[PDB]
Design a protein around this ligand. Structure first.
Ligand SMILES: NC(=[NH2+])NCCC[C@H](N)C(=O)O
Ligand SMILES: NC(=[NH2+])NCCC[C@H](N)C(=O)O
Ligand SMILES: [Cl-]
Ligand SMILES: [Cl-]
Ligand SMILES: [Cl-]
Ligand SMILES: [Cl-]
Length: 129
């Protein structure tokens, strides 16, 4: 599923991401924009052989099981495929665990490089939330 901008903001809010660990909804929408262009089915292989999955490009190295990332963990206790569903529940629950992990949203390199410090409120502007 390719979400609309306000559509995703709404879904993220419903699943409790808005201001989770102090990160406003706009941060999460901006992160999803540059990670996946709002596409739940996005996948990208990393140089190390792990793969990033879903709207927030969650990595098999630590967070999900894909059966093909040697030495990896599955800290969200899910198959990586659950992160590609049109229902964003698994991605949000896993993102909550990731952002609690110590480095906040810097865990997402695209957020650090393209969203951090910017006017992230623009991402939810005009949305009936
Ligand atoms: N959120 C991340 N993927 N961070 C990268 C390092 C992972 C971190 N050492 C951990 O607790 O698994
Ligand atoms: N070149 C870019 N990546 N621009 C993204 C900024 C989008 C802007 N915050 C908006 O939603 O209207
Ligand atoms: Cl957009
Ligand atoms: Cl594996
Ligand atoms: Cl599995
Ligand atoms: Cl933080």
């Amino acid at each position: 599923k390719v979400f609309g901008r306000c559509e995703l903001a709404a879904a993220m809010k419903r699943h409790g991401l808005d201001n989770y660990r102090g990160y406003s909804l706009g941060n999460w929408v901006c992160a999803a924009k540059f990670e996946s262009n709002f596409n739940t089915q996005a996948t990208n292989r990393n140089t190390d052989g792990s793969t990033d999955y879903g709207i927030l490009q969650i990595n098999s190295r630590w967070w999900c099981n894909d059966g093909r990332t040697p030495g990896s963990r599955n800290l969200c206790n899910i198959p990586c495929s659950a992160l590609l569903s049109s229902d964003i529940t698994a991605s949000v629950n896993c993102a909550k665990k990731i952002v609690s992990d110590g480095n906040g949203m810097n865990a997402w390199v695209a957020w650090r490089n393209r969203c951090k410090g910017t006017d992230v409120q623009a991402w939810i502007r005009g949305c009936r939330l």
